[PDB]
Amino acid sequence: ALLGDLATGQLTRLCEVAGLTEADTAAYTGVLIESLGTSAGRPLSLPPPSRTFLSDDHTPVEFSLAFLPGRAPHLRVLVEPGCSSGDDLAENGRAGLRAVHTMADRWGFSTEQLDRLEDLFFPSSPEGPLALWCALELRSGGVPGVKVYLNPAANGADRAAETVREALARLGHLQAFDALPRADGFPFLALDLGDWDAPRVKIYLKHLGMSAADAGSLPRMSPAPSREQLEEFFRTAGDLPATGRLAGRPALTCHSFTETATGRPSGYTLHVPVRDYVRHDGEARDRAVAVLREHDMDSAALDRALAAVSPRPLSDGVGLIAYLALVHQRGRPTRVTVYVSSEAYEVRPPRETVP
């Protein structure tokens, strides 16, 4: 009945799929409740605490599973830690920053990169659609990896490009902005905080009407990923035959920068919002397991994860599987990520057709 109790039940069942110990599970359920603030105790019969863009039903939680061949998926959870402040973006941002800085203190990492950007991303009268989200990578040992997501449009959508250009300059990535491919918008900037082999600055780009061929040409990273693999992923995720475009909710690309010498990204991820291109989650699950099997990943663990989040039949709604992503990063194996919704407030109805 309370938001924190649904969310921590779902997290608990997901930690089991990910193979985390009881100790680490208990740790991370605590962290999730702390991240929700007063909203953790909010009855689910009341409206969401904010009209957050984090999920379609405004649950301020979303999970994701990152798959590699030969092992269990890695589990991650995305939260709006200022959600208890509601829809006032300045107050929601201030509360979210306070949560991240509490995490940084607790786990002993620096926020200097974030702090350098604060005035760009947290102006006095910010514009939507978000102020601050946080994702936690739920690593064995109970000390998570921390990622923060900021709004390039905070100073107005017309200033998003300028804001991203300035952020990249402040972080020392003076060639990165001009390395990005063209796009239709800059919806997010994200930072890896804390202990990472190579922490990334991540720039997210929106592409309206992307085709399969476009999905394989948009990488800017060195070395370039396989075009054929990207095209096939896009076709499978959108159910496009071998014209065909994703002209509803747009596909996004993410370009990651981890070192400043090359001037080039070290990563590219293609994100397909599959929820807008299926009749129901049985179709989205079928597409997700097709991608997983193509890349020699553990699709039965996805099936277990879906049942961990929700007991409903997959065909009784749409939006449980929010996004599918194919992830390339320099010197790392290709990874597939599935983003799974909490559906604490609504189950969107199934569709008779997808036009």
- Residue closer to ligand TRP by CB (options 11, 27) is 11
**Which among 203, 207, 208 has a CA at the least distance from the CA of 165?**
203
- Residue closer to ligand DST by CB (options 111, 350) is 111
| Binder of ligand DST out of 67, 122, 186, 188 (CB under 6 A) | 188
To ligand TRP, the closest distance from the beta carbon of 261 in angstroms equals 29
> Which residues, in sequence order, are CB contacts of 212 under 8 Å at separation 6+?
230, 231, 232, 234, 235, 238, 240, 244
Q: Which residue is nearest to ligand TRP (CB)?
A: 323
- Token couple for 255: 């370009």
Q: Report whether the peptide linkage leading into residue 129 is cis, meaning its omega lies within 30 degrees of zero.
A: yes
Of these partners, ligand DST, ligand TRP, none, which one is at the site of residue 190 (CB under 5 to 8 Å by kind)? ligand DST
To ligand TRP, the closest distance from the beta carbon of 149 in angstroms equals 8
Query: Under the criterion CB under 6 A, does residue 255 sit at the interface with ligand DST?
Result: no
To ligand DST, the closest distance from the beta carbon of 271 in angstroms equals 6
To ligand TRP, the closest distance from the beta carbon of 341 in angstroms equals 9
- Token couple for 225: 């990923």
d(CA 12, CA 25): 6
Q: SS3 of 150, please?
A: strand
To ligand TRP, the closest distance from the beta carbon of 96 in angstroms equals 15
Residue 46's Cβ-side half-sphere holds a number of Cα atoms within 13 Å equal to 10
Query: Under the criterion CB under 6 A, does residue 147 sit at the interface with ligand DST?
Result: yes
d(CA 248, CA 273): 9
Of these partners, ligand DST, ligand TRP, none, which one is at the site of residue 66 (CB under 5 to 8 Å by kind)? ligand DST
Of these partners, ligand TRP, ligand DST, none, which one is at the site of residue 203 (CB under 5 to 8 Å by kind)? none
Judged by the rule CB under 6 A, the positions of this chain that interact with ligand TRP are 53-55, 62, 252, 271, 273, 322-323, 339
**Which among 39, 83, 56 has a CA at the least distance from the CA of 322?**
56
**Which among 48, 121, 59 has a CA at the least distance from the CA of 86?**
48
**Which among 194, 191, 77 has a CA at the least distance from the CA of 136?**
77
- Residue closer to ligand TRP by CB (options 24, 200) is 200
d(CA 125, CA 90): 7
Q: Report whether the peptide linkage leading into residue 60 is cis, meaning its omega lies within 30 degrees of zero.
A: no
- Residue closer to ligand DST by CB (options 135, 210) is 135
Of these partners, ligand DST, ligand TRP, none, which one is at the site of residue 80 (CB under 5 to 8 Å by kind)? none
Of these partners, ligand DST, ligand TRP, none, which one is at the site of residue 240 (CB under 5 to 8 Å by kind)? none
Of these partners, ligand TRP, ligand DST, none, which one is at the site of residue 310 (CB under 5 to 8 Å by kind)? none
Query: Under the criterion CB under 6 A, does residue 198 sit at the interface with ligand DST?
Result: no
Query: Under the criterion CB under 6 A, does residue 190 sit at the interface with ligand DST?
Result: yes
Query: Under rule CB under 6 A, how many of the chain's residues touch ligand DST?
Result: 12
Instruction: Give 48-108 as a 3 state SS string.
Output: CCCCCCCCCCCCCEEEEEEECCCCCCEEEEEECCCHHHCCCHHHHHHHHHHHHHHHHHHHC
- Residue closer to ligand DST by CB (options 116, 332) is 332
Q: How many helices (H) and strands (E) does the chain have?
A: 10, 10
Of these partners, ligand DST, ligand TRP, none, which one is at the site of residue 257 (CB under 5 to 8 Å by kind)? none
Query: Under the criterion CB under 6 A, does residue 78 sit at the interface with ligand DST?
Result: yes
**Matching residue, tokens 């099997």:** 293
Q: What size, in residues, is the chain?
A: 355
Query: Under the criterion CB under 6 A, does residue 157 sit at the interface with ligand DST?
Result: no
Of these partners, ligand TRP, ligand DST, none, which one is at the site of residue 55 (CB under 5 to 8 Å by kind)? ligand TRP
Query: Under the criterion CB under 6 A, does residue 64 sit at the interface with ligand DST?
Result: yes
The residues that touch ligand DST, with contacts defined as CB under 6 A, are 64, 66, 78, 135, 147, 149, 188, 190, 254, 269, 327, 337
